[PDB]
Amino acid sequence: AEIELTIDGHKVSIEAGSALIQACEKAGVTVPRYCYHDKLAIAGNCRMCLVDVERAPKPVASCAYPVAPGMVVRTDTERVKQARENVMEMMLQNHPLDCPVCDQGGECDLQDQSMRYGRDRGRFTEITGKRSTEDKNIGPLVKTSMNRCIHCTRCVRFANDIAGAPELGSSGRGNDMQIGTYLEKNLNTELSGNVIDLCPVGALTNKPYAFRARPWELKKTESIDVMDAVGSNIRIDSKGVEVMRVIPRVHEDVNEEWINDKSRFACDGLKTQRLTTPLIRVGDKFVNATWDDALSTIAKAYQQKAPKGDEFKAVAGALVEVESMVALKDMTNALGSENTTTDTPNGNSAPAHGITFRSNYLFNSSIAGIEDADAILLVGTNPRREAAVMNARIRKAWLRQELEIASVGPTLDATFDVAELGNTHADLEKALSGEFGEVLKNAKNPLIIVGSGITDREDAGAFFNTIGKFVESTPSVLNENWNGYNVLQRSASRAGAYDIGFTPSDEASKTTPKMVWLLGADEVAASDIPADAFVVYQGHNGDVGAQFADVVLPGAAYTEKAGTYVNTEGRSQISRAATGPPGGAREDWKILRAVSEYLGVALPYEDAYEVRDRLAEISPSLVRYDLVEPTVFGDVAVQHSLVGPNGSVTPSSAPLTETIENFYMTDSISRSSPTMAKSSIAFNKDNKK
């Protein structure tokens, strides 16, 4: 299972039958490459990674020559170097001259690795023309210049293997290979926008970023994703006030190379309609005002209404930070009561799995172990519509291994061959007792993934007690070294919200609200409003909620702060700010501390570290980062998630509706971008065939 090979004095042992480039990169030897990639299948196309191997007449392609035991491998024979110059010359004398106006100026990997391996006189005459290539439209989200495509075929392999939209095929021979389609139809798939970070030349590129920047002006900054519960691995390109674009950084457990395609275009959703100043309504006449004026107006209105007991319904918004939610819960409990629910359509009730025993709550299997699962089934969700990179790992496993996959509930087209078994709870219990009671018990480490959309419904009862009772009642695999019972969330911060323990408590839920803390709660805001509203909308990008507001608080978004976030697997991941907040726009937990000053019940903590100290005092899984093992309550948690909500709700046969209609317009950032409006109207006959 290990083999020594010698690359130029560097002996190194790697696994048998592996890739020679993997040996070179383990040996710390830089080998130039264009059509190799890590998480794609190997093609021999780019012909650059040539290396000299003993007992071989030709320098073989190190991307695909498998590891033979005990090889002598030279990357520095003059045949190798003075053939690499040869191959780079014969890659460049049909490339166009777009280098000043090609988007990847300091990132054309061809251009980057040209000077140290290349050759000056690309031989030409005015008589000679190279060739031209027809530009092609792949979608209004991706700008495309196919003149530059060096036919690395990384795009094709990505659209086939990982994306599952095979609509980007190759075409033609000779000079006349074009990539895309000659039906001229737009790609409208999930995670399409990974491909512009993937084509190593600037043939594919970003449409709203198109020419705005060029990568040495850019304070490239580590941060954590939003608009998905997975807490993806982003990195923000910043010009200093504006945010230019995002790049998915590498993080091998959680979504190793990819971004959710909604998360790629928060930049056009950021700098467009932010709340820069507090706004107050005279009434249908909505004027901005001084900060202290608005604070004193809020405190004076609180003293006017005096909502002392079991009132002032704060509600967890979609996209916030843990520290603001800690300030929210602590300020409400300091003020006198507890009424904090979430955005969900009538989730003014417990999520039918207790805040006790953390393992019951989140996606407690590892994201990598998804490709270690024998056969899984999904209920109440469309994982293409939510957490698209989770769908990417699903397809990665489904092409790798043999998995029996079934959807139950919503009718979904996902690219890994589900077997839908009804739109009803009775169909669910039938399918569990019928044949997956054989499969999941017979299989080795199965998983069972549930949507958040079922927790929205009043059918969080018998529908959810059925699957919990099945988890207990099939205890043979799902107890000790594996935990299949898992849910996903729509938003990221709802995971940390249920971690801190926002309570929907029925002693307080059966009352009417008279003060409302909206934190971006665009979804629930049409219903939950009284006449005596006094809606305090804190946040940014006032799409919905500011339109229902009484006082606007211009909160800073995720980009401008060190928002410690929780994924849907319980990992704490801490951010960094990449720009200051625009305008007045102070930071959110500081806003709630100042409200605690004016609405005169002050918090016991005000500096930066004190927030983290109280957060450690609340749940110390959130101060130790990105490493979770909840092995201790794998068995008692399903008892305490089953017996509680048992039979309080008769199983309603209302069908399992689609959780998200428009994926592209969500979350009060992606809700409000002219990128996502264009991609949302990319549904038409152009996409269909």
Partner 1 sequence: MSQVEPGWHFWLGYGVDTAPCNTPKEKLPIRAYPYKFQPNYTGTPGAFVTYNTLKPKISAWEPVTKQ
Partner 2 sequence: YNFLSVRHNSRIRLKTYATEVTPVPSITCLYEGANWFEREAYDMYGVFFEGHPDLRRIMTDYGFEGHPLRKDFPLTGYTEVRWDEEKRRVVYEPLELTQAFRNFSAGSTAWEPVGPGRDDR
Partner 3 sequence: SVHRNTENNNPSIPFEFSPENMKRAEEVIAKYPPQYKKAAVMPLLDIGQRQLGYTSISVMNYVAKLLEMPPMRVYEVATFYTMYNRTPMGRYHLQICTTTPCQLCGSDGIMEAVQNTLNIKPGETTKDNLFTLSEVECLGACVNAPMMAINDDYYEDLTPEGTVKLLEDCKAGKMPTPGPENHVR
Q: Are strands 3-7 and 60-61 parallel, antiparallel or unpaired?
A: unpaired
Cα dihedral sign, 9-13-17-21: negative
Which position among 119, 220, 441, 614 is part of the footprint of partner 2 (CB under 8 A)? 220
Report the 3 state secondary structure along 298-318: HHHHHHHHCCCCCCCCEECCC
User: Which does residue 689 touch among ligand FES, partner 1, partner 3, none (CB within 5 to 8 A, set by kind)?
Assistant: partner 3
661 binds partner 1 (CB under 8 A): no
223 binds ligand SF4 (CB under 6 A): no
User: Which does residue 45 touch among ligand FES, partner 1, partner 2, none (CB within 5 to 8 A, set by kind)?
Assistant: ligand FES
User: Which does residue 24 touch among partner 1, partner 2, partner 3, none (CB within 5 to 8 A, set by kind)?
Assistant: none
Which position among 80, 99, 301, 601 is part of the footprint of ligand SF4 (CB under 6 A)? 99
Q: What does DSSP assign to residue 146?
A: G
x-or-dash string of contact with ligand SF4, 127-166, rule CB under 6 A: ---------------------xxxxxxxx-----------
Burial string for 246-267 (b: 16+ CB within 10 Å, else e) reads bbbbeeeebbbbbbbbbbbbbb
* Rounded distance between C-alpha atoms, residue 150 and residue 131, angstroms: 13
The least distance separating partner 1 from the CB of residue 280, rounded to whole angstroms, comes to 10
For binding to partner 3 (CB under 8 A), which residues are involved? 166-174, 176, 178, 181-184, 689
The least distance separating ligand SF4 from the CB of residue 163, rounded to whole angstroms, comes to 12
Longest Cα separation, the chain: 90
Which position among 1, 115, 282, 306 is part of the footprint of partner 2 (CB under 8 A)? 115
Residues with Cβ within 8 Å of 288's Cβ and at least 6 positions away in sequence, in order, are: 277, 278, 279, 280
Q: Are strands 72-74 and 3-7 parallel, antiparallel or unpaired?
A: parallel
Query: Hey, how many other C-beta atoms are within 10 angstroms of the C-beta on 194?
Result: 23
Which of 1/115 has CB closer to partner 2?
Answer: 115
Residues with Cβ within 8 Å of 585's Cβ and at least 6 positions away in sequence, in order, are: 274, 275, 276, 277, 540, 554, 555, 556, 560
Q: Is residue 676 within 8 Å of 262, Cβ to Cβ? A: yes
The least distance separating ligand SF4 from the CB of residue 14, rounded to whole angstroms, comes to 27
Q: Is residue 229 within 8 Å of 491, Cβ to Cβ? A: yes
Which position among 49, 73, 201, 270 is part of the footprint of ligand SF4 (CB under 6 A)? 201
The least distance separating partner 1 from the CB of residue 343, rounded to whole angstroms, comes to 17
Which of 139/542 has CB closer to partner 1?
Answer: 542
601 binds ligand SF4 (CB under 6 A): no
Structure tokens that stand for 293 in this block: 């004026």
3-state DSSP: the chain helix, strand, coil percent, rounded to 5? 30, 10, 60
DSSP H or E run through 430: helix 425-431
Beta bridge partners of 535: 516
What is the Rg, in whole angstroms, of the alpha carbon atoms belonging to the chain? 28
Which position among 126, 216, 476, 481 is part of the footprint of partner 2 (CB under 8 A)? 216
User: Which does residue 116 touch among partner 1, partner 3, partner 2, none (CB within 5 to 8 A, set by kind)?
Assistant: partner 2
- Site residue total, ligand SF4 (CB under 6 A): 24
Q: Is residue 167 within 8 Å of 155, Cβ to Cβ? A: no
* Rounded distance between C-alpha atoms, residue 50 and residue 75, angstroms: 8
Residue 460 phi, psi dihedral angles, 5° rounding? -75, 10
Which of 298/428 has CB closer to partner 1?
Answer: 298
x-or-dash string of contact with partner 1, 504-543, rule CB under 8 A: -------------------------------------xx-
User: Which does residue 106 touch among partner 3, partner 2, ligand SF4, none (CB within 5 to 8 A, set by kind)?
Assistant: partner 2
Which position among 4, 38, 85, 112 is part of the footprint of partner 2 (CB under 8 A)? 112
Q: Is residue 428 within 8 Å of 653, Cβ to Cβ? A: no
Kindly list the distances between the CA atom of residue 113 and the CA atoms of 25, 38, 44, 126, 246, in Å, as whole numbers in the listed order: 16, 18, 19, 28, 23
For binding to ligand FES (CB under 6 A), which residues are involved? 33, 35-36, 44-49, 61-63
Q: Scan residues 544-563 and list those touching partner 1 (CB under 8 A).
A: 544, 546-549
User: Which does residue 176 touch among partner 3, partner 1, partner 2, none (CB within 5 to 8 A, set by kind)?
Assistant: partner 3
Q: Scan residues 253-282 and list those touching partner 1 (CB under 8 A).
A: 271-277, 279, 281
Structure tokens that stand for 388 in this block: 């698209």
The least distance separating ligand SF4 from the CB of residue 454, rounded to whole angstroms, comes to 39
Task: Give the total residue count for the chain.
Answer: 689
Q: For residue 402, with 0-12 CB atoms within 10 Å meaning exposed, 13-18 middle and 19 or more buried, which class applies?
A: exposed
673 binds partner 1 (CB under 8 A): no
Which position among 113, 153, 348, 541 is part of the footprint of partner 2 (CB under 8 A)? 113
The least distance separating ligand SF4 from the CB of residue 125, rounded to whole angstroms, comes to 21
* Rounded distance between C-alpha atoms, residue 266 and residue 675, angstroms: 9
Q: What does DSSP assign to residue 610?
A: H
Structure tokens that stand for 105 in this block: 């100026």
Which of 157/540 has CB closer to ligand FES?
Answer: 157
* Rounded distance between C-alpha atoms, residue 30 and residue 561, angstroms: 37
332 binds ligand SF4 (CB under 6 A): no
Which of 110/551 has CB closer to ligand SF4?
Answer: 110
Segments in 177-311 forming alpha helices (H): 291-305
Q: For residue 270, with 0-12 CB atoms within 10 Å meaning exposed, 13-18 middle and 19 or more buried, which class applies?
A: buried
User: Which does residue 153 touch among partner 2, ligand SF4, ligand FES, none (CB within 5 to 8 A, set by kind)?
Assistant: ligand SF4
Q: Does the annotation flag 267 for ligand binding?
A: no
The least distance separating partner 3 from the CB of residue 688, rounded to whole angstroms, comes to 11
User: Which does residue 416 touch among partner 3, partner 1, ligand SF4, none (CB within 5 to 8 A, set by kind)?
Assistant: none
Structure tokens that stand for 226 in this block: 């939003």
Which of 544/628 has CB closer to partner 1?
Answer: 544
The least distance separating partner 2 from the CB of residue 76, rounded to whole angstroms, comes to 8
x-or-dash string of contact with partner 2, 24-63, rule CB under 8 A: ------x-x-------------------------------
Q: Does the annotation flag 46 for ligand binding?
A: yes
Q: Does the annotation flag 24 for ligand binding?
A: no
Query: Hey, how many other C-beta atoms are within 10 angstroms of the C-beta on 66?
Result: 9
x-or-dash string of contact with partner 1, 284-303, rule CB under 8 A: xxxxx---------------
Kindly list the distances between the CA atom of residue 417 and the CA atoms of 169, 331, 445, in Å, as whole numbers in the listed order: 21, 49, 20
Q: Applying CB under 8 A, which part among 217-225, 468-476, 485-493, 675-683 lies near partner 2?
A: 217-225
* Rounded distance between C-alpha atoms, residue 594 and residue 278, angstroms: 14
Give residues in contact with partner 1 (CB under 8 A).
241-242, 271-277, 279, 281, 284-288, 541-542, 544, 546-549, 582-583
Q: Residues annotated as binding site for [2Fe-2S] cluster?
A: 35-36, 46-47, 49, 63
Give residues in contact with partner 2 (CB under 8 A).
30, 32, 76, 106, 112-113, 115-116, 215-220, 240
Q: Residues annotated as binding site for [4Fe-4S] cluster?
A: 95, 99, 102, 108, 149, 152, 155, 199
Q: Residues annotated as binding site?
A: 35-36, 46-47, 49, 63, 95, 99, 102, 108, 149, 152, 155, 199
Give residues in contact with ligand SF4 (CB under 6 A).
95, 98-100, 102, 104-105, 108, 110-111, 148-155, 179, 199, 201-204
